[PDB]
Symmetry: D2
Subunit: 295 residues, 4 copies
């Protein structure tokens, strides 16, 4: 037998950082969960019990806190690139670092119509994420994403004209509820190293904001022919607005809400045009994916 692939490191490292403006007294907080996995010339730790090649996972955890102390943690694309670059430059035998960051929302509170200097609210479990792969001699590959964005529209979704055969019971519809949890990922062109990532720093927050805005607007305004058709429209617009993105991937559950026939009870009408009360279904769910790239 032989080691074909190996990676190891520290997962679920929770980090909080505060920035304090001494001039204005305004404080800003960032909270993230970080995972760092390394690859390189480490096979002998598995095959020969040779720990001399292992940067202890506890040391990786220390390094994450030290790096956060000495560098900005925003945008997360920059922080992940700095963190991953550190490991491949510091250790001769480590040749790749894989950094995943989940950013948690701490939104400044408005108290009496004014932004509060040091109080925050978690408005939703929506996350902003990055995956940064730093590979020695191959640059920095970054995938940025938003996840956990849960939306519903109560009309202006349709689904008809699908294949009907002896396995089909679903009725065609011209008016249904559509609800999903949005997972959207945009993949940046490969960067040659940290200097190039630094040169594009303003694009990271702007592109996140654009991806979010396009998702919400398209969902709300599209008279949707299917999840497939609506998600394609989203991906097309994001690619049009940011030339440094190579691909956009969406993964969308179709969270079903079923009509409830109440006609057995005193002829009560609660289907089709009379549908008012529905039963949200926890499972099963449709799952629709697509990756859109350039011609």
């Amino acid at each position: 037998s032989a080691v074909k692939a190996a990676r190891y490191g520290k997962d679920n490292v929770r980090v909080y950082k505060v920035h304090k403006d001494e001039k204005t007294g305004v404080q800003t907080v960032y909270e993230m969960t970080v995972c760092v996995l390394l690859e390189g010339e480490i096979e002998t730790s598995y095959t020969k019990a040779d720990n001399s090649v292992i940067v202890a996972t506890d040391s990786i955890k220390n390094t994450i806190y030290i790096t956060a102390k000495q560098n900005p943690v925003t945008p997360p694309e920059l922080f992940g690139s700095i963190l991953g670059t550190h490991f491949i430059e510091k250790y001769n035998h480590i040749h790749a670092a894989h950094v995943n960051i989940v950013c948690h929302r701490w939104t400044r509170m408005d108290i009496d119509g004014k932004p509060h200097p040091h109080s925050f609210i978690r408005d939703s479990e929506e996350k902003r994420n990055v995956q940064v792969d730093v590979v020695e001699g191959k640059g920095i590959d970054i995938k940025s994403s938003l996840s956990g964005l849960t939306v519903l529209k109560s009309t202006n979704s349709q689904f008809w004209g699908f294949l009907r055969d002896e396995y089909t019971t679903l009725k065609e519809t011209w008016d249904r509820i559509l609800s999903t949890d949005v997972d959207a990922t945009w993949q940046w062109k490969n960067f040659s190293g940290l200097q190039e990532v630094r040169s594009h720093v303003p694009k990271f927050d702007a592109t996140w904001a654009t991806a979010r805005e396009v998702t919400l607007k398209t969902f709300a305004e599209d008279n949707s022919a299917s999840v497939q058709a609506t998600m394609y429209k989203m991906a097309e617009q994001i690619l049009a607005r940011q030339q440094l993105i190579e691909t956009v991937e969406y993964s969308l559950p179709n969270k079903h809400y079923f009509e409830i026939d109440l006609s057995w009870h005193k002829g009560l009408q609660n289907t089709g045009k009379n549908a008012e009360v529905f039963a949200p279904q926890s499972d099963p769910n449709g799952l629709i994916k697509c990756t859109v790239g350039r011609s």
Copy 2:
């Protein structure tokens, strides 16, 4: 042996209802999870296998959907009172109904600064809840609550002057992070029945809004001497603003964020006034409760 207490019913009933304004085209959605448990002269179903006394839990589920079809579902205090009253009036041998409702957020989307007529976002896992106990000949007891409201302030929290003995290692502090998930419950004076609940309908949404506003403002503005002292201030204000409330209960975790000493690494300063990077602790957590009532 004898049956000392018994209750049974249906839990985790998910319900969605849509309201459509034909004039404006505006749609409004409500989604809830409902539990109904009944009590009464039902001992023989346990002791003698006498199912004749059992209103099937499946029928309870049907009744919830039928009631939602025929009545408003908001405010939830009113809907729960209607639902509970139904069971004690319909069935001679059922003498109490216990209704718990969790309301999920579907907040209307703003697209280009304008409220969208039929698209919604789940902005946070914060819930608005009710517990309604309808007891034949004893009226309607309602407890209203908010839960899952997660907040953090990065300064203006202190904790010093506590008991110090041979079990104590905690250092006094004049500047710490304070973060919690707020669970707040206000208990209404007993209502004689549905007519009285109906007469107070406008107070339910207003009092929820007041409880939320007081919680957020007090948390943000109090230079907190302890969780205990801050929560008391919240409860005091709510009782002052709504005379029909008898008690206010708060249950608050103290979600700890620990300083990280980095001085072992090149004398890096990250404690006390130099603290920038902290480690959020998943467990253990302080848990502080109090119930405040009138003199």
Copy 3:
């Protein structure tokens, strides 16, 4: 306003303890999650910002580890009684301690038919729990429980003869699946203090084992007329086998498995006597409770 009730302390304290037999080399591990909440003359911490009355929650956490170091942690009824007694005896102004313990399973591995001296497996998320309330001058009240015991029988469950009215759609059945997660609690007679709890130490593990055995046997062997009837039989037997128990409480979900009609597809028969494939339902679920005591 006035403080009507207050309690505070530390939740989610994870504790592991190992016992090492030096003679045999056999090691035994215990892992628990502990919560301790205190009550007493502590109102002024809420109303006057007087922290002098507060035993810091961090100190409570220390005390839990110190107590586990110096005392056996099994049976959990004994450990909880020792822990709660400590707080009311140590602190003049603390008059009640409320201790909740969840015990996690670490079951010794069998390797080649022989019990291993120091290796363990988590066989199921079933828990053994205690709630211990130690109240100065009122003794020690203990409720013991098992929870998270998930079972299913594929036949020998029936449900017919229930109330049928205009809200009823459920068909009577003489053969259905019955599946539940068992939550069972037995409440001990009040103990005068630690000496009396110590005198009954052997009864705690034996009664847990009896409660588990009776639950499993009765579930498997009863030709069940309803959840209600089967659970009563369980509670009756436990009370008969242990005179120091005053009440037994069961709380059982009815986790539904629905038939799937496949007759629309080539006349496929999958209902009633031909039912083979079913759809487990995640929600809603029946919920049935009862508390059984002595005549």
Copy 4:
């Protein structure tokens, strides 16, 4: 823009099947959660709102139940292969099916030392899984796995001789706790189609059993030099015992248990050789992976 990749289908389809032996009266239950995603000539549903190419996800759900009705559901490798083959053969324009199955434990109860004919217990959240990719003209690729197997050993784990630099605080140790949740995957050689999968049916359950047995034995008996070294030993043995496996992958968290220094309290000794009480850490955790293949 262009569609670079697309797949869609139904996730979280819960299925239960019962087998009844009419001779012996013994019943056997199987419960699974199934996901099926399809690929093929479906781009136009995304780009042109052409639903004619879509096999509705609701129809996929129907097909899963119908297939379970007409075929054995065990071993899951066989069931997944049948299910995936169905879609690529039935639909001209569908060219790949991706089937994921999670099998849930329902273990027959022993009542009074005898196996019960129709009563079952969920002994642990450990799963047996398969991933089956059926690609037209490229055969059937199957990855089998076990996951959620949680183990702990209280001694006979060491970790010393790792890289020490200015980021390192971890002390070397010759005696520590080791606990993990095992995720192990074995990848079968490519099969040409259903006939070949059928010819190897007995190997699937046997290899699962071998993988489980090797994992448990090696974990319990290895005087572990690191997670890396122990996991390699496991993978090596599995490959030696089943020639039709090409690779074995393990992904293991290192779930840390920290010593608690209690010396500040009356010189209490609870570290090194005197360590009895430990603090399980919920996060962060080490994460160690490796893929082992043949020379």
